[PDB]
Design a protein around this ligand. Structure first.
Ligand SMILES: CCCCCCCC/C=C\CCCCCCCC(=O)OC[C@H](COP(=O)(O)OCC[N+](C)(C)C)OC(=O)CCCCCCC/C=C\CCCCCCCC
Ligand SMILES: CCCCCCCC/C=C\CCCCCCCC(=O)OC[C@H](COP(=O)(O)OCC[N+](C)(C)C)OC(=O)CCCCCCC/C=C\CCCCCCCC
Ligand SMILES: CCCCCCCCCCCCCCCCCCOC[C@@H](O)COP(=O)(O)OCC[N+](C)(C)C
Ligand SMILES: CC(C)CCC[C@@H](C)[C@H]1CC[C@H]2[C@@H]3CC=C4C[C@@H](O)CC[C@]4(C)[C@H]3CC[C@]12C
Ligand SMILES: CCCCCC/C=C\CCCCCCCC(=O)O
Lengths: 334, 496
């Protein structure tokens, strides 16, 4: 990748959801700003690593048949491998979804009561002061955004063309969540009539956020690098192509380098080959998997898998039903 | 001869000035001091696993803190661990960490929002219902065992739609489900509350089967802000002494007369009593005693005022036809008042049905079954028809009054000083109150529409103005001030 501390979501993660108080010890990519955060906001640190994990699972769902599947190497010093060392379209998505993942996980964890330092906390406040017992705590919805912008965007202020890209795409993730929240209202009063209406905003599901950014991925604009400074020196910023197209802000994804070829293995570009992949497992018709293999003759494997069948299927879990076997024909390519 | 008929135009302007100054203050207090009406807080439940321990020894499951439960982070983790349905309980601690409830919160409303996944083998059936096994406890201090408040069963219907095509590509997407009512508690008397919800499954009875795959439960808690209650009580405390004094002044003026009182005077006084009833801080015992019946009291008190205000307007119009009338008895307006008695009676039953059962079962909704819905709507429909009949009989009464005025205001040259001044006064007295009543109604309706559609607050410089709050304090003060003007201006004029 490009950020290192993302590796907390894999391997060593080992469900470190508060039972493993490893604080500012293992975080491998950390500047002075991140040190101050992780030392002051310890109860919420496990929710940041989980947020990254969520983003990883979503990108692997969203790109399951796009040649580049969001692969994560075992080194853990570079969670996605070198594929993200370039300012390409794939990086724009990974940055946006990771940013969204952190804000999402933090907000949910605060709603569960996993931290006493999340947003508002006071046991007293008569003298008028916008406290819990006088005015209410309405600032708790912006906390997840604070954590994502405070912790993640700490190395992104260096004057570099890539830094501009990263800042924009990370905000795109946070805005994707804000743009998809729903307004609900409860009507109550003298007889239930709407003399007092109380409204609240609810969080979207993360699948909707994934789909949104997937559409923005395909619609992503090309930018070029421009440099200037007042004093002797240069600062690199991006210039969107507004000669024909319409690039926006806080809604879209940006890039400025070309994506690699993902058909064949190439260790210098960070590209993993598609030589061993499957197809015709979705609609069993024509799908992206026909180009995935970049080859021909998708006919190689038969399987006899065992699965549970003839079940009642209760609302929760461990249905406890009978087993059976089925024969499958898998259009595996070489 | 009322006082308003002997005041010069100058004196009326002075009184109007004083009344306006108070109306401006009423708005300022609500906007600039009060924090706003209510707050909603969102909660996410924790999935605690009972290791086949809870049979009769009720063990209360605490989401977080010391002695926390063994919890599953994601429902899918249940399958590798062999955890079955009925062994998972959803725990919510109502106050958030390092927060407490206080008696100044007047009520709590609780609603649930289910997060249900779409899977091809687990779809929601046409008549899908969720049967919740719900227990609530209270605690006063951290180092004490939880004490039970309620244990009930809460069936609710599911209303869910799926907007994506139902094909093997969108599995894992959530249903779009509506909000389900859950609980109403009419008093806040304890610092801490603990809620445990279980969803038992029974295959042979279709209890929680075919209700989809449920992954999370969200709870929203709505309460009135403490600062809003404190300011509201201060306002009522100010008003009560003022209302009491004018009521006594009015009474003495009516009874110390050379002639018995008339019907309009009796009605104006009775309207004063209804407003005195709504201005008494009876709620200032809600901070010291756990009296769960205060929410229905509030409604009854408020409902009575409405009936009295609508009736006043009928009698007033009926008392100001010039020729052929000046009737003074109650038994003969039943043609115009009946609709009010029937409408209010039917609404009373509707509120009593919902509120009275809440007092004995906090997990109640009149809208749970088809029969309950049919009866609840029948009462609302009847009340609506009666209110429309009221509006048409008031409009005809007014029409007829005005045509009579056009007549009386024409044949003026042939009466004497005594009769001419009498009727000219009545004509003015009528027109004045009509213009004021319409202005008061217009302002109330327009500001209800600017409270139901705008954001709720406005940040302008260093001052944040609460708009929903200013609405409540301004209108509340307005009608009381209007009744104050009514008693002073329309009391008998003293003559020597
Ligand atoms: C002849 C008629 C005489 C009338 C007066 C005689 C009675 C006067 C007695 C009491 C008046 C004050 C009542 C205070 C009640 C305090 C309740 C409380 O427990 O105190 C909470 C907060 C203080 O806040 P704190 O303790 O955090 O500091 O009280 C607040 O905010 C209150 C802020 C100010 C709100 C009240 C404004 C009243 C104006 C009404 C205009 C009506 C126009 C129609
Ligand atoms: C019809 C079109 C619109 C209807 C407007 C309804 C206005 C509702 C205003 C409510 C209000 O302002 O509530 C003040 C008092 C009740 O005070 P409370 O402390 O019991 O309420 C406690 C409840 N809390 C604390 C939340 C305020 O309401 C009262 O006294 C009586 C207020 C009388 C309002 C009559 C409006 C007639 C106008 C047009 C008719 C055509
Ligand atoms: C809410 C419901 C409100 C109910 C309000 C009921 C109001 C009853 C209001 C009932 O008022 C009746 C008294 O004014 C009758 O007055 P007197 O019997 O003293 O007659 C005086 C005779 N001289 C002295 C003038 C010659
Ligand atoms: C202006 C005046 C006449 C209004 C009077 C309103 C009455 C009903 C109010 C004013 C002050 C109130 C009291 C203020 C404080 C307390 C302490 C609390 O722990 C129990 C309720 C109690 C004891 C209240 C009872 C009701 C009360 C007496
Ligand atoms: C005026 C009707 C006479 C018969 C009994 C009525 C008694 C109480 C009046 C208050 C009820 C008003 C409805 C409550 C508001 C909602 O519901």
């Amino acid at each position: 990748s490009y950020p290192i501390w993302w590796s907390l979501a894999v391997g060593p993660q080992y469900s470190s959801l508060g039972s493993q108080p490893i604080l500012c010890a293992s975080i491998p990519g950390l500047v002075p700003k991140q040190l101050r955060f992780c030392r002051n906001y310890v109860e919420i640190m496990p929710s940041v690593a989980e947020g990254i994990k969520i983003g990883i699972q979503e990108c692997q769902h969203q790109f399951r048949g796009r040649r580049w599947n969001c692969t994560t190497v075992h080194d853990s010093l570079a969670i996605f491998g070198p594929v993200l060392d370039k300012a390409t379209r794939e990086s724009a998505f990974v940055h946006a979804i990771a940013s969204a993942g952190v804000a999402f996980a933090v907000t949910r964890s605060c709603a569960e009561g996993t931290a006493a330092i999340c947003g508002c906390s006071s046991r007293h406040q008569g003298s008028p002061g916008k406290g819990w017992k006088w005015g209410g705590c309405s600032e708790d919805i912006e906390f997840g955004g604070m954590v994502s912008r405070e912790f993640a965007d700490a190395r992104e202020n260096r004057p570099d063309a890539r830094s501009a890209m990263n800042r924009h795409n990370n905000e795109a993730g946070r805005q994707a969540i804000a743009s998809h929240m729903h307004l609900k209202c409860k009507c109550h009063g003298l007889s239930g009539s709407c003399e007092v209406k109380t409204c609240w905003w609810s969080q979207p599901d993360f699948r909707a956020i994934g789909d949104f950014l997937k559409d923005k991925y395909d619609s992503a604009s090309e930018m070029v690098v421009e440099k200037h400074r007042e004093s002797r020196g240069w600062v690199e910023t991006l210039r969107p192509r507004y000669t024909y197209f319409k690039v926006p802000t806080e809604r879209d994804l940006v890039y400025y380098e070309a994506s690699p070829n993902f058909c064949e293995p190439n260790p210098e570009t960070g590209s993993f080959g598609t030589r061993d992949r499957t197809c015709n497992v979705s609609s069993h018709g024509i799908d992206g998997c026909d180009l995935l293999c970049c080859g021909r003759g998708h006919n190689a494997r038969a399987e006899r898998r065992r699965e549970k069948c003839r079940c009642v299927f209760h609302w929760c879990c461990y249905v406890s039903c009978q087993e059976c076997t089925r024969v499958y024909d898998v259009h595996t390519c070489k | 001869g009322a006082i308003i008929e002997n005041m010069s135009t100058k004196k009326l302007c002075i009184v109007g000035g004083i009344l306006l100054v108070f109306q401006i203050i009423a708005f300022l207090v609500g906007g600039l001091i009060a924090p706003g009406p209510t707050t909603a807080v969102s909660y996410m439940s924790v999935k605690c696993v009972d290791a086949r321990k809870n049979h009769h020894k009720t063990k209360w499951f605490v989401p977080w803190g010391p002695n926390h439960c063994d919890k599953i982070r994601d429902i899918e983790e249940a399958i590798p661990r062999e955890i079955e349905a009925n062994d998972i309980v959803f725990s919510v601690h109502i106050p958030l960490p390092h927060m407490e409830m206080s008696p100044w919160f007047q009520f709590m409303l609780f609603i649930l929002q289910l997060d249900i996944a779409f899977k091809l083998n687990n779809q929601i059936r046409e008549n899908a219902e969720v049967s919740m096994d719900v227990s609530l406890a209270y605690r006063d201090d951290a180092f004490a065992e939880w004490t039970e408040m309620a244990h009930e069963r809460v069936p609710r219907k599911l209303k869910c739609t799926f907007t994506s095509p139902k094909t093997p590509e969108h599995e894992g997407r959530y249903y779009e489900c509506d909000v389900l009512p859950f609980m109403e508690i009419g008093s806040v008397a304890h610092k801490f509350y603990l809620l445990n919800i279980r969803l038992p499954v029974n295959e042979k009875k279709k209890i929680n089967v075919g209700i989809g795959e449920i992954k999370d439960i969200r709870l929203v808690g709505i309460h009135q802000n403490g600062g809003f209650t404190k300011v509201w009580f201060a306002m009522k405390t100010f008003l009560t002494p003022s209302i009491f004094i004018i009521m006594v002044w009015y009474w003495r003026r009516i009874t110390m007369m050379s002639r018995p009182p008339v019907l309009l005077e009796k009605v104006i006084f009775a309207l004063g009593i209804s407003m005195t009833f709504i201005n008494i801080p009876v709620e200032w015992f809600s901070i010291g005693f756990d009296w769960t019946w205060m929410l229905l009291f509030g409604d009854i008190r408020q409902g009575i005022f409405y009936a009295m205000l609508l009736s006043f307007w009928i009698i007033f119009c009926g008392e100001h036809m010039m020729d052929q009338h000046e009737r003074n008895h109650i038994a003969g307006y039943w043609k115009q008042v009946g609709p009010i008695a029937v409408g209010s009676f039917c609404l009373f039953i509707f509120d009593m049905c919902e509120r009275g059962v809440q007092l004995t079962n906090p997990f109640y909704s009149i809208w749970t079954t088809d029969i309950g819905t049919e009866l609840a709507m029948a009462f609302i429909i009847v009340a609506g028809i009666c209110l429309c009949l009221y509006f048409l009989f008031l409009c005809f009464m007014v029409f007829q009054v005005f045509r009579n005025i056009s007549g009386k205001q024409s044949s003026l040259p042939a009466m004497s000083k005594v009769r001419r001044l009498h009727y000219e006064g009545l004509i003015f007295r009528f027109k004045f109150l009509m213009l004021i009543t319409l202005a008061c109604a217009a302002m109330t309706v327009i500001f209800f529409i600017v409270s139901q559609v705008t954001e709720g607050h406005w940040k302008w410089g260093g001052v944040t103005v609460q708009v929903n709050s200013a609405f409540f304090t301004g209108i509340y003060g307005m009608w009381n001030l209007y009744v104050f003007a009514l008693m002073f201006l329309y009391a008998p004029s003293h003559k020597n």
